[PDB]
Design a protein around this nucleic acid. Structure first.
Ligand SMILES: [Mg+2]
Lengths: 103, 48, 109, 116, 142
RNA sequence: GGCUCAAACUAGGAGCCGAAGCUGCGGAUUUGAAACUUGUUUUCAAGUGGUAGGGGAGCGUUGUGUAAGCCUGUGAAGGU
RNA sequence: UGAAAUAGAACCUGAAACCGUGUGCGUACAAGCAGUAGGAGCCUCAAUUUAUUGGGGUGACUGCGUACCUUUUGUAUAAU
């Protein structure tokens, strides 16, 4: 049992009880989200490929928390041009636990 | 009538001065706004 | 335990004493003493003196059996340099480093 | 009000030398060399954040091409067949399926080949 | 979900035989180079050698089109002044016939340590026989 | 490398690859506009490569006051 | 002896350059600003009902990649 779902402009192949980091979601911690635009469900030797979505199939996830990622130093340097600039970055993510995949 | 600890000059009252030649980020490093090597970039230069 | 001797301030370069130290590192006290007494290098007299002092320390201050001892660790460190002037041709001077070295020896089972 | 620069200069140089840990020779030891190596490392990392998105699509496309040719199709016909079948599976997921689930990728190739 | 690499210990290299008799040199060499690199595998990762072992027989009977048998020249430099040597396709195939296909494939492989590793798997033999019957290579038309 | 009914050329067609371009998702910021309205809130639109150079906002350091305070041998400064 | 002796007289603290010793990993078929983005293996701490994750060290192998300042129309420049 696995499914292909969409979150955050990205696609994820997921299985049940997997912990997945995705782009930050406007969803309270501990709440359950249902994805009803799953792209494929493979629950064994049976393959349901959506064109573009598998109608009826749904993946329920729960929000564990919203965190910030690892700091990245962004360094820009123009040599001989008296130019330098540094910047910090931490990307927000939300962590989802895949609770159920219904084909 | 407040404390000596909590008087403020008010917004716009104070401006920080420019310090030339204190790095790239300040916007006044190296030449200090004088541009490149002519008579005006030199030390005792004036506008006669 | 490990018993130490220090020979701070030997009038010789540590680069020279290091060749001697590399050959006695890890050996038994007897083999190391043989190597040191029959070496032709000046650094061996210093390493032998420091090793003998460490053996005597282990036998007198700690009551160890020197029959089971070994050079557990040895290293040479740079000491203080004496700075001298060397005249050269055409009135030019050079500096001379008269290097000294510190020898640390620890013997143990 | 005389200001001594020692303490701040020390901590400033320690930040750079800390970022230069693991570099060879003077690049992890001496500040004049470490500070250039840190700046160049940041420059490379900035460029390679962009280039890694290209490299991984390169890899996915290679794996998809291999998977499709195992099933009797080329990459450029398989992707066209997916776009004609209205299948929105990304190259990252398609490459994952091709690598780790051969029968499902066979099914996807069958759908694309029926669309052509 | 992450994109995984092939984990060298988990890769197996299969053995195949290619009969070079009457095939075009470059067109056969492209297929051999792809097989040696492992491009036909869905676990292909550029830093891992996932290729196969290609055994090639009848390497002297490889064919070139046009007047390339007499006009394709192989140069080398010895490292000594004026030390540029030239041989022919026909003379090279008379002298060391496995060199022709080895050169074609070596140019088509990556030029580094992994390329050197992956050309080790190319086994060339002039004539109909090869000594690798213990590896049981399967016939591969390519 | 190598290529000859091409892996060349000519004329057409269909696919695909391909950039920091465009789109998607998340975040920041400048200006302007609307409203609990000196960040109080949300939005929206257009922007955000940059030398000389102009403009704006800050960080740290020494010292004075706040401070006969507060911290500190149950461990200050400094070092790592 | 002393609170303290890597406070022992070159004596408070005791940075860096520089030079040793020890441990772990890598390295003797491979070409270049020495990193970076990936990435196998090994080593080590922790969890975990037990070789899977997480942290740390190393980095086989792949892609990309000609220091910095100054001065210039323009510099990897074999210009300073
Ligand atoms: Mg002291």
């Amino acid at each position: 049992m696995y499914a292909v779902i969409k979150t955050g402009g990205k696609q994820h192949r997921v299985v049940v009880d997997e912990l997945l980091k995705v782009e930050l979601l406007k969803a309270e911690q501990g709440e359950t989200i249902t994805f009803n635009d799953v792209l494929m469900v493979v629950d064994g030797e049976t393959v349901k490929i959506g064109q573009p979505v598998v109608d009826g199939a749904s993946v329920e996830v729960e929000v564990i928390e919203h965190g910030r990622g690892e700091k990245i130093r962004i360094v820009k340097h123009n040599r001989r041009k008296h130019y330098h600039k540094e910047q910090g970055h931490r990307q927000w993510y939300t962590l989802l636990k895949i609770k159920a995949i219904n084909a | 009538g407040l404390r000596l600890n909590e008087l403020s000059p008010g917004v716009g009252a104070k401006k920080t001065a420019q310090r030339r030649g204190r790095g790239i980020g300040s916007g006044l490093g190296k030449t200090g706004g004088r541009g490149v090597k002519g008579q005006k970039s030199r030390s005792g230069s004036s506008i006669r | 335990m490990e018993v130490t001797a220090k020979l701070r301030g030997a009038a010789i370069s540590a680069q020279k004493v290091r060749l001697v130290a590399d050959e006695v590192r890890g050996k038994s006290i007897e083999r190391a003493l043989d190597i040191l007494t029959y070496s032709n290098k000046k650094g061996a007299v210093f390493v032998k003196k420091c090793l003998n002092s460490a053996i005597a320390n282990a036998e007198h201050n700690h009551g160890l059996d020197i029959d089971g001892l070994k050079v557990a660790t040895i290293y040479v460190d740079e000491g203080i340099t004496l700075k001298r002037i060397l005249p050269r041709a055409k009135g030019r001077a050079d500096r001379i480093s008269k290097r000294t070295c510190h020898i640390t020896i620890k013997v143990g089972e | 009000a005389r200001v001594k620069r020692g303490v701040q200069a020390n901590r400033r140089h320690k930040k750079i030398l800390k970022r230069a840990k693991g570099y060879y020779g003077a690049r992890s030891r001496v500040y004049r060399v470490a500070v250039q190596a840190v700046t160049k490392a940041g420059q490379y990392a900035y460029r390679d954040r962009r280039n890694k998105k290209r490299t991984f699509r390169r890899l996915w496309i290679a794996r998809i091409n291999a998977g499709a040719r195992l099933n009797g199709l080329s990459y450029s016909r398989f992707i066209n067949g997916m776009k004609k079948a209205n299948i929105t599976i990304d190259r990252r997921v398609l490459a994952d399926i091709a690598m780790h689930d051969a029968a499902t990728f066979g099914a996807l190739v069958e759908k694309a080949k029926a669309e052509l | 979900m992450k994109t995984l690499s092939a984990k060298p210990a988990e890769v197996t290299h299969d053995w195949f035989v290619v009969d070079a008799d009457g095939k075009t040199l470059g067109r056969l060499a492209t297929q051999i180079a792809s097989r040696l690199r492992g491009k036909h595998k869905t676990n292909y990762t550029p830093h891992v050698d996932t290729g196969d072992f290609i055994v090639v027989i009848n390497a002297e009977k490889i064919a070139v089109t046009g007047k390339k048998a007499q006009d394709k020249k192989y140069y080398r430099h010895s490292g000594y002044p004026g030390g540029i040597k030239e041989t022919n396709f026909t003379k090279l195939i008379a002298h060391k016939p496995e060199d022709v296909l080895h050169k074609a494939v070596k140019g088509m492989l990556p030029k580094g340590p992994l390329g050197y590793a992956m050309i080790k798997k190319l086994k060339l033999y002039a004539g109909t026989d090869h000594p690798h019957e213990a590896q049981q290579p399967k016939e591969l038309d390519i």
